[PDB]
């Protein structure tokens, strides 16, 4: 009878732009070994990141000494809150603005992050400051990683199709900068070169199938998941005494290489399509190997997913948020004379799990 | 067209029973003051708890010294994992056992906890060890507190009604014992006297309304939420360097007193019933003030919610899990000759939010 649709959308990020050249220079200062300082310069170079938005400054000496201290986890969580509320309120609002709905119509808020833990959290502030119904259904989704926006979209899809008349509001926000530390190990150095801050927001609504939908609407055709074997170590998320971390496996790129195509293939098979029918590839911009290996698993030229590279270059990895950016860019660039430019988004989660969705943008 | 139903259900807990008399004695030893040692004895007495199940021992001197140490948060999270996987796997299985369905029918797993953070986490192990489809949709719900099973049920309700043919599996597990510490403050002493360990599991399925449903089925009539004003401080959840905490306000009981009736009233009004039509009150057994004040807000004798007191007495507060226990007891005790014994469950979440549901048990 029915099918889900993105009716509004928006993005935001901390004002502070941080040039990768500076970050690399600032980090290189610290190591002062011939091999060590060299290794670091090389790592930052390979990231394909020009800038990241960061709510906390790596410039301030006052923040420097705090980052050194042990047992600060709780202060960082409060700091996530202190910076996230205005950002998330602002972006949620912008997603709702220019829509013809009463707040009474907004029946779900799915809040998403893997970079702060605190309750009552940001989700409550969204409903208070935006004036959403206090009877709103809420779901807080945590530690589902870079791919968490797919899990959130899937959840909102189920809401609006089960309650046609109502809308679902999804908000993702990630403040990696809040969890920044000094490098105990190689993985610390790598992680701290990639992750940035950002938030994104989506309003989802139902639709009777074969309605003349608005232009700019994105239709959630289908969603998909695959939990993989032999790749528990791929993406790991933890809570340390001095911050939340993500620990990546050296083998993650080959995990991704071996898993992307068959998963995406099977999805297309069950949807009755081919790589030929896909105009857009919203590969999560987690890093250069993540895009490269996704693309080389599929049959596609690396640089085809141009929005993914663009977002990585400008923002870095904003975990769950990145794919919202990718999608907003894709809606902006009407790159075809076709009525529906259709695409596939996917990302990777601890498991390893491949999460994604097929969608048609209504031009 | 349709409405949701609980088709299977199960509970479990750490083997180790801890008598409150011992716990109180063990904790009283630690303070050596006339007022101090006295105050503590009084607190434990007031809890209305005989026993709690605990995955970690308060007996072992080896565990004693670890509980003292700072910055152990990450080890505790791994410890949550080490103990949660078998429990959660076992209970999820038992919820599924004695059911006709193939694993291909299980399309959602909503995993719930506010007492450990780790990825890849327990949810992945449920699908691996239970052999559930790897294409299963997952949602991990964290820090939604004692009431999180209502948020999870609601979410599963939306899944099965949006995908009639499939089932949703909900698993809640809470291991407070993992987060145990030495008391920095009065609230630490109070918290450590109430919270225990437990898990529960639910299989939810769809149904065409006016089907002769099975006996023992519980029908999710409706769910409800209310985010309150001026009660941010009521229930607070945080992540410290040496464990996750919950900080309760002295005013929480009056927050509950002032909010339960109008919220529950309005729900009944929108469902067209009265307190008269409610045969069962599944008040979250968070503590004696929580039940007492809920009951005195509503028009009901305190001791009416007998399952709530029973569960508190035997297990303590197992946050999200407790209401599953309450419901399992209620299904067990067929207390009426009526065909449908109907009830209301609710609980309290950081916000403060009142979350709950109306249900008819098909007897
Ligand atoms: C999913 C958890 C993400 C954990 C983030 C830890 C790393 C934060 C990196 C923030 C950028 C800091 C770079 C710098 O030191 O200049
Ligand atoms: C939602 C977070 C709850 C944090 C719970 C921390 C304390 C749990 C108490 C476990 C019982 C410890 C035994 C005792 O000292 O009596």
Q: Domain boundary residue among A163, A197, A215?
A: A215
Picking from B171, B200, B215, the residue at the C-terminal end of a domain is: B215
CA-to-CA separations, A274 to A148, A298, B126, in angstroms, rounded: 25, 11, 33
Residue A80 CB partners (closer than 8 Å, separation 6+): A113, A115, A116, A117, A118, A175, A178
Enter the DSSP assignment of A177.
G
Q: How far is the CA of A142 from the centre of ligand 1 (A)?
A: 17
Are β-strands A280-283 and A340-349 bridged in parallel, bridged antiparallel, or unpaired? parallel
CB within 8 Å of chain A, chain B residues 337-356: 349-353
Chain B interface includes A184 (CB < 8 A): no
Q: Which residue is closest in CA terms to ligand 2's atom 5?
A: B176
Angstrom distance (rounded) from CA B189 to CA B183 = 6
Q: Check whether residue A243 and residue A183 sit in a common domain.
A: no
User: In this structure, are A287 and A355 located in the same domain?
Assistant: yes
Q: Are residues A123 and A226 in the same domain?
A: no
* Alpha carbons B267 and B273: distance in angstroms, whole number: 9
Residue A180 CA: nearest ligand 1 atom is 8
Backbone φ and ψ for B43, nearest 5 degrees, come out as: -55, -50
Q: How far is the CA of B180 from the centre of ligand 1 (A)?
A: 29
Domain check: are B229 and B194 in the same one? no
Residue B157 and residue B4: Cα distance in Å, rounded?
Answer: 6
* Protein residue closest via CA to atom 5 of ligand 1: A176
| Shortest distance, CA A82 to any CA of chain B (angstroms) | 14
Residue pair A52/A192 in contact (Cβ under 8 Å)? The answer is no
List, in order, residues 6 or more apart from A260 with CB less than 8 Å away. A293, A294, A297, A298, A346, A354
CA distance A202 to B310: 44
Q: Hey, which of A31, A191, A193, A315 would you mutate to test ligand 1's pocket, going by the most ligand atoms within 8 Å of its Cβ?
A: A191
Number of domains in chain A: 2
CB of A32 within 8 A of CB of A64?
Answer: no
CA B188 and chain centroid, separation: 20
Round to whole Å and give the CA distance between B140 and B172: 10
Q: For residue A110, what are the contacts with CB-CB under 8 A and spacing of at least 6?
A: A138, A139, A141, A152, A155, A156, A168, A169, A170, A171
Sequence-distant (≥ 6) Cβ neighbours of residue B158 within 8 angstroms: A155, A158, A159, A161, A162, A163
Give the residue numbers spanning the domain of B142.
1-215
CB-CB under 8 Å, B158 with A155 = yes
Active-site residue list of B: 146
A38 CA from centroid of ligand 1 (Å): 20
Asked if A139 has any chain B CB less than 8 Å from its own CB, the reply is yes
Burial label, B185 (beta-carbon count in 10 A; 0-12, 13-18, 19+)? exposed
Q: Which is nearest to B220 in space by CA: B160, B276, B282, B153?
A: B153
For residues B21 and B37, state if they share a domain.
Answer: yes
DSSP B311: H
Question: In terms of Cα–Cα distance, which of A3, A159, A152 is closest to B154?
Answer: A159
Say which ligand is closest to the CA of B188: 2
Q: Is residue B356 a contact partner of residue B298, using CB atoms and an 8 Å limit?
A: no
Sole residue written with tokens 């049920």: B153
Distance CA B14, CA B52 (A): 9
Tell me, in angstroms, the distance from the centre of ligand 1 to residue A195's CA.
5
* d(C-alpha A47, C-alpha A20), whole Å: 9
Compute the distance between CA of residue A74 and CA of residue A85 in angstroms, rounded to an integer.
Answer: 17
Q: Which of A146, A172, A199, A246 is catalytic?
A: A146
Residue whose token pair is 């028009």: B299
Q: Do B121 and A350 touch (CB under 8 A)?
A: yes
CB of B226 within 8 Å of a chain A CB? The answer is: yes
Query: For residue B119, what are the β-bridge partners?
Result: A237
∠ at Cα B120 (A257, B5), nearest 5°?
A: 110
Residues in A closer than 8 angstroms to B223, CB to CB, are: 137
A242 → chain B, closest CA residue: B241
DSSP SS3 for B61? helix
B226 Cα to the center of ligand 2, angstroms: 28
Residues of chain B neighbouring A247 (CB-CB closer than 8 A): none
Residue nearest to atom 16 of ligand 2 (CA): B23
Residues from chain A contacting residue B138 (CB–CB below 8 Å): 144, 151, 225, 353
* Closest ligand 1 atom to Cα of A114: 1
| Boundary (domain end) residue, out of B174, B193, B215 | B215
Chain B CA closest to residue A163: B158
Nearest of B59, B67, B65, B52 to residue B188 by alpha carbon: B67
Of A135, A225, A239, the CB nearest to B117: A239
A339, with CB counted inside 10 A (0-12, 13-18, 19+), is exposed
Query: Which among A70, A139, A239 is the nearest to B139, CB-wise?
Result: A139
- Whether A121 and A257 share a structural domain: no
- Answer yes or no: do B225 and B133 share one domain: no
A246 catalytic residue (yes or no): no
Residues A181 and A32 in one domain: yes
Ligand nearest to the CA of B59: 2
Q: Does A113 touch chain B (CB under 8 A)?
A: no
Q: What is the dihedral of CA A286, A326, A175, B119, to 10 degrees?
A: -50
Q: Which stretches of A164-234 are DSSP H helices?
A: 186-192
Residues of A in contact with B227 (CB under 8 A): 124, 127-128, 134-136
In the structure, which protein residues have their CB atom closer than 6 angstroms to any atom of ligand 1? A 23, 26-27, 58, 114-115, 176-177, 179-180, 191-192, 195, 237, 244-246, 319
Q: How far apart are CA A50 and CA B293, in angstroms?
A: 57
Task: Supply the DSSP symbol for A317.
Answer: B
Is the same domain home to B270 and B346?
yes
Q: Report the pocket of ligand 2 as residue ranges, CB < 6 Å.
A: B 23, 27, 58, 114-115, 176-177, 179-180, 191-192, 195, 237, 243-246
- The rounded Å distance from CA B185 to ligand 2 centre is 13
Answer yes or no: do B270 and B177 share one domain: no
A41 and chain B: CB distance < 8 Å anywhere?
Answer: no
Do residues B164 and B50 share a domain? Answer: yes
In sequence order, what E strands does B254-294 have?
Answer: 280-283
Residues B327 and B345 in one domain: yes
Task: Give residues with Cβ within 8 angstroms of A274, minimum separation 6.
Answer: A268
For residue A134, give the nearest of A171, A104, A102 by alpha carbon. Answer: A104
B265 touches chain A (CB under 8 A): no
């Amino acid at each position: 009878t029915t099918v889900a649709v993105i009716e509004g959308m928006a993005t935001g990020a901390p004002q502070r732009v941080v040039a990768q050249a500076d970050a690399a220079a600032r980090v290189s200062e610290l190591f002062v070994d011939p091999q060590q300082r060299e290794r670091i310069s090389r790592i930052y170079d390979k990231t394909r990141i020009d800038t990241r938005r960061m709510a906390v400054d790596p410039l301030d000496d006052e923040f420097d000494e705090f980052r050194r201290e042990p047992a600060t986890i709780r202060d960082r969580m409060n700091l996530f809150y202190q910076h996230a509320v205005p950002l998330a309120v602002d972006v949620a609002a912008r997603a709702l603005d220019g829509l013809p709905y009463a707040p009474d119509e907004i029946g779900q808020l799915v809040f998403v992050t893997s970079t702060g833990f605190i309750a009552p959290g940001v989700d409550v502030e969204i409903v208070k400051q935006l004036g959403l119904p206090r009877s709103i259904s809420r779901v807080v989704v945590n530690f589902m990683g870079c791919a968490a926006a797919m899990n959130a979209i899937r959840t909102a899809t189920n809401y609006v199709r089960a309650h046609p008349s109502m809308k679902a509001l999804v908000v993702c926000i990630e403040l990696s900068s809040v969890n920044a530390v000094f490098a105990d190990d190689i993985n610390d150095v790598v992680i701290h070169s990639l992750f940035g801050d950002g938030c994104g927001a989506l309003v989802i609504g139902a639709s009777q199938v074969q309605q003349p939908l608005p232009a700019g609407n994105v239709v959630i055709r289908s969603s998909f998941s695959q939990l993989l074997d032999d790749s528990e170590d791929g993406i790991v998320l933890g809570v340390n005494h001095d911050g939340i971390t993500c620990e990546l496996s050296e083998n993650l790129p080959s995990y991704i290489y071996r898993s992307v195509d068959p998963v995406v293939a099977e999805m297309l098979r069950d949807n009755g399509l081919s790589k030929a029918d896909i105009d857009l590839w919203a590969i999560h911009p987690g890093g250069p190997k993540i895009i490269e290996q996704s693309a080389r698993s599929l049959g596609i030229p690396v640089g085809r997913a141009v929005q993914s590279w663009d977002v990585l270059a400008q923002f870095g990895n904003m975990l769950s948020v990145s794919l919202i950016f990718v999608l907003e860019m894709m809606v902006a660039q009407a790159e075809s004379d076709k009525p529906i430019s259709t695409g596939v988004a996917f990302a990777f989660a601890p498991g390893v799990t491949v999460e994604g969705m097929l969608f048609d943008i209504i031009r």
